[PDB]
Design a protein around this motif. Structure first.
Motif, short mmCIF file in Angstrom:
data_model
loop_
_atom_site.label_atom_id
_atom_site.label_comp_id
_atom_site.label_asym_id
_atom_site.label_seq_id
_atom_site.Cartn_x
_atom_site.Cartn_y
_atom_site.Cartn_z
N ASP A 1 6.19 -8.57 -7.92
CA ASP A 1 7.35 -9.03 -7.89
C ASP A 1 7.88 -8.33 -6.08
N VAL A 2 7.03 -7.49 -5.36
CA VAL A 2 7.51 -6.32 -4.57
C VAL A 2 6.51 -7.03 -3.62
N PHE B 1 0.81 -0.71 0.13
CA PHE B 1 0.32 0.07 -0.02
C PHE B 1 0.77 1.76 0.31
N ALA B 2 1.80 1.19 0.04
CA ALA B 2 3.15 2.15 0.29
C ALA B 2 2.99 2.94 -1.14
N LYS B 3 2.98 5.26 -1.61
CA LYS B 3 3.29 5.63 -2.02
C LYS B 3 4.02 5.17 -2.90
N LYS B 4 5.26 4.31 -3.08
CA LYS B 4 6.25 3.83 -4.27
C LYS B 4 5.56 3.25 -4.80
N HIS B 5 5.03 2.41 -4.54
CA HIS B 5 4.42 0.48 -5.29
C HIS B 5 2.60 1.49 -6.32
N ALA C 1 -0.33 -0.34 -7.85
CA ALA C 1 -0.57 -1.03 -7.03
C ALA C 1 -2.51 -0.67 -6.85
N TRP C 2 -2.17 0.58 -7.41
CA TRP C 2 -3.85 1.07 -7.10
C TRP C 2 -5.00 0.34 -7.24
N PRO C 3 -5.17 -0.26 -8.72
CA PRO C 3 -6.39 -1.29 -9.39
C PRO C 3 -6.57 -2.36 -8.21
N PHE C 4 -5.77 -2.94 -7.17
CA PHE C 4 -6.09 -3.92 -6.02
C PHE C 4 -6.37 -2.89 -5.34
N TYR C 5 -6.35 -2.19 -4.95
CA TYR C 5 -6.52 -2.28 -3.59
C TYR C 5 -7.76 -2.23 -2.53
N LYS C 6 -8.84 -1.95 -3.91
CA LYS C 6 -10.55 -2.38 -2.90
C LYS C 6 -11.10 -3.56 -4.14
N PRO C 7 -12.00 -3.98 -4.33
CA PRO C 7 -12.20 -5.53 -4.42
C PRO C 7 -13.01 -4.63 -5.40
N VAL C 8 -12.70 -5.43 -7.56
CA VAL C 8 -13.25 -5.03 -8.65
C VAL C 8 -14.67 -4.07 -8.79
N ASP C 9 -14.35 -3.04 -8.91
CA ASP C 9 -15.84 -2.25 -8.73
C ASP C 9 -16.53 -2.79 -10.01
N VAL C 10 -17.16 -3.85 -10.82
CA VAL C 10 -17.78 -4.52 -11.57
C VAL C 10 -18.78 -3.74 -12.51
N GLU C 11 -19.91 -3.31 -10.79
CA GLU C 11 -21.21 -2.80 -11.55
C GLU C 11 -20.13 -1.55 -12.68
N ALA C 12 -19.16 -0.20 -11.96
CA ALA C 12 -19.46 0.87 -11.87
C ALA C 12 -17.93 0.58 -13.83
#
Ligand SMILES: CCS(=O)(=O)Nc1ccc(Oc2ccccc2)c(-c2[nH]c(C)c3c(=O)[nH]ncc23)c1
Length: 107
Positions: free
Chosen positions: A98-99, A15-19, A23-34
């Motif tokens: 990789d991380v 979750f660090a800023k470096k990645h 990483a951001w598309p994996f932070y929360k569940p895939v919003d299938v509706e949106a």
């Protein structure tokens, strides 16, 4: 366990800023509706994301680092299964993996 504290550290790194750029598309569940991914649940039987993994770790849902690791790898595998191999999100998953793999190998 000590290995579950190592798992908390793996999540802080993911979750660090470096990645964040990959990483951001994996932070929360895939919003299938949106996203209009109405075929996602037909292909992906067990969706997984970083916030769900964090909540499960906090709720003591993992007995050890291998159970934690299996959910992180489930998240990547879902991405590799659903999307075409040339998709931008697949390249991002590979960078995030990789991380994870480097840190997980240290314990
Ligand atoms: C925080 C979760 S979100 O749903 O709130 N935001 C959000 C936004 C856009 C997204 O798409 C892309 C597509 C190209 C590059 C970057 C992301 C995605 C997304 N995430 C995953 C794992 C996807 C997938 O496997 N396929 N297609 C889309 C997937 C998730």
């Amino acid at each position: 366990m000590e290995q579950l504290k190592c798992c908390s550290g793996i999540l802080k790194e993911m979750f660090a800023k470096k990645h964040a750029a990959y990483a951001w598309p994996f932070y929360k569940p895939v919003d299938v509706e949106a996203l209009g991914l109405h075929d996602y649940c037909d292909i992906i039987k067990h969706p997984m994301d970083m916030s769900t993994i964090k909540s499960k770790l906090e709720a003591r849902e993992y007995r050890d680092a291998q159970e934690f690791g299996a959910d992180v790898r489930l998240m990547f595998s879902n991405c590799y299964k659903y999307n075409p191999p040339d998709h931008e999100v697949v390249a991002m998953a590979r960078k995030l993996q990789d991380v994870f793999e480097m840190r997980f190998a240290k314990m």
